[PDB]
TrEMBL record:
<dbReference type="GO" id="GO:0004601">
    <property type="term" value="F:peroxidase activity"/>
</dbReference>
<keyword id="KW-0575">Peroxidase</keyword>
<dbReference type="GO" id="GO:0034599">
    <property type="term" value="P:cellular response to oxidative stress"/>
</dbReference>
<dbReference type="InterPro" id="IPR002016">
    <property type="entry name" value="Haem_peroxidase"/>
</dbReference>
<dbReference type="InterPro" id="IPR019794">
    <property type="entry name" value="Peroxidases_AS"/>
</dbReference>
<feature type="binding site">
    <location>
        <position position="42"/>
    </location>
    <ligand>
        <name>L-ascorbate 3</name>
    </ligand>
</feature>
<dbReference type="GO" id="GO:0009507">
    <property type="term" value="C:chloroplast"/>
</dbReference>
<feature type="binding site">
    <location>
        <position position="167"/>
    </location>
    <ligand>
        <name>heme b</name>
    </ligand>
</feature>
<dbReference type="InterPro" id="IPR010255">
    <property type="entry name" value="Haem_peroxidase_sf"/>
</dbReference>
<feature type="binding site">
    <location>
        <position position="173"/>
    </location>
    <ligand>
        <name>heme b</name>
    </ligand>
</feature>
<dbReference type="GO" id="GO:0016688">
    <property type="term" value="F:L-ascorbate peroxidase activity"/>
</dbReference>
<feature type="binding site">
    <location>
        <position position="172"/>
    </location>
    <ligand>
        <name>L-ascorbate 2</name>
    </ligand>
</feature>
<keyword id="KW-0408">Iron</keyword>
<feature type="binding site">
    <location>
        <position position="41"/>
    </location>
    <ligand>
        <name>L-ascorbate 3</name>
    </ligand>
</feature>
<feature type="binding site">
    <location>
        <position position="79"/>
    </location>
    <ligand>
        <name>L-ascorbate 4</name>
    </ligand>
</feature>
<feature type="binding site">
    <location>
        <position position="132"/>
    </location>
    <ligand>
        <name>L-ascorbate 3</name>
    </ligand>
</feature>
<dbReference type="GO" id="GO:0000302">
    <property type="term" value="P:response to reactive oxygen species"/>
</dbReference>
Amino acid sequence: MAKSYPTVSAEYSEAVEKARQKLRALIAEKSCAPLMLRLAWHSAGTFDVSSRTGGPFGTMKNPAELAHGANAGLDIAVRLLEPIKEEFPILSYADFYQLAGVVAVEVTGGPQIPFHPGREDKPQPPPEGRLPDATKGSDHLRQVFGKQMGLSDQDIVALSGGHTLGRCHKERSGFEGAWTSNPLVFDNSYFKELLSGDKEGLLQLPSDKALLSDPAFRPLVDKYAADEKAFFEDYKEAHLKLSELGFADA
Ligand code: HEM
Ligand code: NA
């Protein structure tokens, strides 16, 4: 009951479904689901509840936001998706990029995240600096996910499982390597690798390691490493909330 979703026309809903189908095909055919999940997450994760600025309002299309250091490489994702967007002028960029994130999780075998249309494309990007610093720890994660976005500790650990997909690139973030041996498969391998420690061929960031030493985050790591179904359930709920920060709040 925290949300009151807006009414959109049948044509809008039809466009969402047709765009979803095109996105499912492109994301699978181009093997770019991890990048598209990162696109949706960096679009949404800038929300600060105290000012109601940032969030999933289409601003990743804005070159000034693409130029943020944390968004290096997301210009590639925007350009890859633009041919589909051109076929769906009725849709907001805000909805379109969140739909791409939901599709990225689906096509890699993850949970089916509900999707509710109607986000507006806002004119101003957030200030740079809202997203998490990979070199910091649990206090910082709580400032970013909790104080800014309004999400719970469970949400932090579940969403960190997005690193089950993809990898870091030296020219984008400056880190280099994948968290998992199967980076196109949405599963609980991220948490299993965290628990087994550093090892040749795989990466862990300081922010990942902070989940192991924190007394509230660690039981959640243990749970998700042991129980993929529980991870999928909590991930679905957290991704839904993330994708709707500042949107349709009652
Ligand atoms: C918890 C704090 C987080 C930190 C510090 C963080 C940091 C990073 C960094 C440094 C990269 C590498 C970017 C590059 O070099 O290409 C990355 C990639 C990625 N992030 Fe996170 N991230 C966080 C949370 C999340 C969340 C919440 C999600 C989604 C639910 C997510 C999904 C991804 C994905 C899928 C990639 C790989 C992209 C690719 O393969 O191109 N991350 N993250
Ligand atoms: Na994986």
